[model samples]
Target: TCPFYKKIPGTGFTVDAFQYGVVEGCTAYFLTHFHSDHYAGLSKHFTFPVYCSEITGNLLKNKLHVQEQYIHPLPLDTECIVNGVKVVLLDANHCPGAVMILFYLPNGTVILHTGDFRADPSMERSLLADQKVHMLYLDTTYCSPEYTFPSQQEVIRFAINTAFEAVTLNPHALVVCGTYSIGKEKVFLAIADVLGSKVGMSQEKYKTLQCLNIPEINSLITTDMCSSLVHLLPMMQINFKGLQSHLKKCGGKYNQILAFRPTGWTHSNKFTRIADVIPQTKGNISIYGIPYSEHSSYLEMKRFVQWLKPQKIIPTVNVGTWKSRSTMEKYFREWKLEAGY
Candidate 1:
């Protein structure tokens, strides 16, 4: 990695430290985000310094058995000089410990890389990467002008309200919702948040959230066990009679709110079909839904692009990306595509 000049095999002349040097200089490396496409090449050669944040470091350590010499765990928003290349780490709010890297070269050139960032209005902590930048790389997973989505908190609140409303409408019914056992701890906590009291969250969920660096929220809430507000396994499942039987034993049967988490991915339509099979029992059951998803709707993606108005946007990522370059070209062609030409 060099500051003034560098060259690679296929990509012509490059200024950043990521280039594969010609005859001299050390091999350049990179920082990574949680996107699978971005981190795909980690195990391919495994010879360079892969800078990572602490959370990301923990996850990588848990996943792969790589040597300690190759991994560099740097603090977030910190700048470091590595092999004559100045690199800065910034928070990328796509996932818990995701990050973006800013590569500063010696020839008065700069490169800003964003892995996968979502539009989160409520969380001001997501603004660690919006400093003065020269070159911009964006995550256009949903680049259309019509992309939009509600916040996680809002979705949880709506799910709770919908559950309450459905319970009021149907006297003897069962409500079935779908969420991931590992992902829906926030949804469970949101239930507790709205209830302003202890709701059911499995012990495993409490532990999982702790592992994810979000244990404070679960400390205030509890999980549901059949009818009792007991801390049980997060994967606990219950049917109508089973729920009713548990409720009756506790002598606190107020329209059962059957909440459980799934460890699979069932789309909106499939979830609807699953909800259709709820038995016509004595208590009203409303199937609520708050799936744990990383990407937002197409409308949200467009709104994000409109907010972060950058000059030259280059879309990366392979299979999972939603044709981000095409979508961004259609939406932000006037200011961005001219540079490409």
Candidate 2:
């Protein structure tokens, strides 16, 4: 297993360590977010206590169906006594229920664990603005310079603009957006705003949104077939075969299907804006892999680190081996020197 899932130094508490077996030295385990990869080892049979955001804690009951005793909803940006330490949770800007956890040890060492997050501009105005962290467990999904790209607001606008182009050019098109249980709702919602229609989705997906404590969205969502031209569905269903069958099920309401893939896998430093990214078109079916990522880019991480100036940084991603780990450290070293080592 990956060592990143292990315990944080100077603390008995472990984070996102469900996949690993029991460690007698560890007292409590915490989940940074509700993503599958972070909660991979969680199961109904497991009996360890967990702490997470209120929304994620609710998912534990509804989504994961864990034992009732595992509930420990930590308040956002507010310190609460837990495991003999003052712990806090803050917005990660990655998903609906995702958060960056802060653990304040008795020795006054502050540890900031950014589970998985996009370095959105709003993050600058948060409590971290005046906080100085000793150690930063960063989400290094795009730790290298190659992953740099445009900001999220620009990408969201690009997706909406492109969606408008497709829908206006072909009014008979049924647009779909790729999504997980919790992420990428913003893109489709923006499209709905510009088109004067609510984004359509499955009843279950709507329920999932409700569980996230999203308000005033009930009127913004519709479940009826052909109720709206734009819809939200899983990324795996964006292929031609599934899209073709889906259109067939719609009974000729739409002439073609256009899907948006909101993931980091489509991004590159060569493209400074999401609008510049190309789309894959095959006859009536089209797929646009938009660079609407939820993770921080290389330059964003640099600015964040330089501003905070943490004594040490421990990457929480892409560190499965010594070579891969050191590769990320080189970039970290450069940023560290820029921050005045």
Candidate 3:
């Protein structure tokens, strides 16, 4: 192993040596976030003790509802030395329990392994760190220069605008949208604001929201709940089938309105293609693509790098390579308009 630096290659399936029963000298493992993509291998496997924040640990046990005795939960920003290496937890607000780990060694080397973070402005508070990071492992999901993304506020505004367009074009429409029960609740709230009231939520969904202690929302609504164009509320789970029949039941001239997050590129012609931005029905509907995402835009990602001014940057989520590195570097230049190096 190189002094103060060593990276053991893993087999195609394993992420690191410790994962493949090579934990002879390994001291600790860090779980960055609870996202399925990162936690897939760790779940119900990996017998070694894992370190994460208290919230993340609670999520692992209570939210994810998994029972694993190997997890070690620590408070955020607390520095703990495990196996002679220093580890600190920093807030990473992709989800409630998200964290970014700062690994410090005896040789004055520090590695900031960000477990899938976004450059959203809300992250500014959490990004305030005590130490200047020497190496930053970045989330490169939006590294490509050609890719531009909207913010959460912008997405909500767009969703509202779409709702307005739908109402103006067709009155008496029973519109339904698709969103994850937990993640996309904000967008649903925004749509309700546009519609002007809250519709009744399914008992299961209401229970999930209640568990999180999310405030009860009352705004824009379903046609049944709507008094007129001046008042409305959004409903959950816009079904794929029987959409036309629902519209007819509402006593509206419009044929049908359905909100779907895209799952696949194609769908049957039976449904009208209004607001196809919502995802389509497919297995594992909760993961991957959705109507709204909470990550940073390409522009924000570039600006975040400039703001942080870390010495060495590492890319994560997607494959880390020279091409990906160069692509991110391009974004920084474009967003910051800096040319050299």
Writing each residue's lDDT as its tens digit, candidate 2 over 287-311 gives: 8877777888788878888887889
Estimate candidate 2's alpha-carbon lDDT, on a 0 to 1 scale. Answer: 0.81
Tens digits of per-residue lDDT for model 1 on 1-341?
Answer: 34331232222222224333342544545545533544544552366666677766555555444466787778776678766667777766566666666777677557667656555543234433345455566665555434334455565565567545554565332344333333344554554444444544446444444545665654554445443332223233344554555446545435454544432223443434332423233444322334444554455544444455555556553223456445556666654443342
- Tell me the number of clashing residue pairs for each predicted model: 22, 0, 21
lDDT of 3 at 299: 69
Candidate 3, position 153, lDDT: 63
Candidate 2: regions farther than 4 A off:
1-5, 267-272
- Which candidate would rank higher by lDDT, 1 or 2? 2
Please list the C-alpha lDDT of all candidates, in the order they appear.
0.49, 0.81, 0.53
Model 3, 1-341: lDDT tens digits are: 21121231221111122323444455555676655655554545456677776655655665455556887887777778766667777776465566767777677767676666667555555635455767777777756644454455655676678666666676544445554423555655666566764644444444444433344432333333334332211233244344444455456444445353422112221242233444343321211123244455466777777766677665664454667667666655554447233
Error of 3 at 237 (Å): 9.1
Pull out the clashing pairs in model 2. none
Predicted candidate 2: what Cα RMSD to the true structure? 2.1
TM-score for each predicted model, relative to the true structure: 0.59, 0.92, 0.63
Candidate 2 lDDT trough over 10 residues, lowest sum: 265-274
At residue 229, candidate 3 shows an lDDT of 33
